Curated annotation (Swiss-Prot):
The family this protein is said to belong to: Belongs to the glycosyl hydrolase 17 family.
Protein's cellular compartments: Secreted
Name recorded for this polypeptide: Glucan endo-1,3-beta-D-glucosidase
Free-text tissue specificity from the UniProt record: Expressed only in pollen.
Lineage: Eukaryota, Viridiplantae, Streptophyta, Embryophyta, Tracheophyta
PTM text: Glycosylated.
Annotated region (Disordered), positions in chain: 1-12
Quaternary structure and interacting proteins, as annotated: Homodimer.
Disulfide bonds: C14-C76
């Protein structure tokens, strides 16, 4: 009938800790990329892309992928790096993916 906007999600965020050994996080994209919705939609937009991290791609898909299985915390199968983090880590302009696009 009529297109209605959506609020902001909150609770937890599944993403690789920004600091771990690049090579370590890199293992994510490699694995996740073997899922389907991982490789491809990992294209940056420009908002926070730069600087762009290695496992950045994995962090992107982590949004949909996480909600692809069952939007559960166990949806994180990337690695011991990409997992549910504390409250919204987004300090501001840079918003972390919580699942919603």
């Amino acid at each position: 009938a009529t297109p209605t906007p959506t609020p902001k999600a909150a609770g937890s965020w599944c993403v690789p800790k920004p600091g771990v050994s690049d090579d370590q996080l890199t293992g994510n994209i490699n694995y996740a990329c073997s899922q389907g919705i991982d490789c491809g939609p990992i294209q940056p937009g420009g908002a926070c892309f730069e600087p762009n991290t290695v496992k950045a791609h994995a962090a992107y898909v982590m949004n949909l992928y996480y909600q692809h299985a069952g939007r559960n915390s166990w949806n994180c199968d990337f690695s011991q790096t990409a997992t549910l983090t504390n409250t919204n880590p987004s300090y501001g302009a840079c918003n972390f993916p919580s699942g919603s696009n």
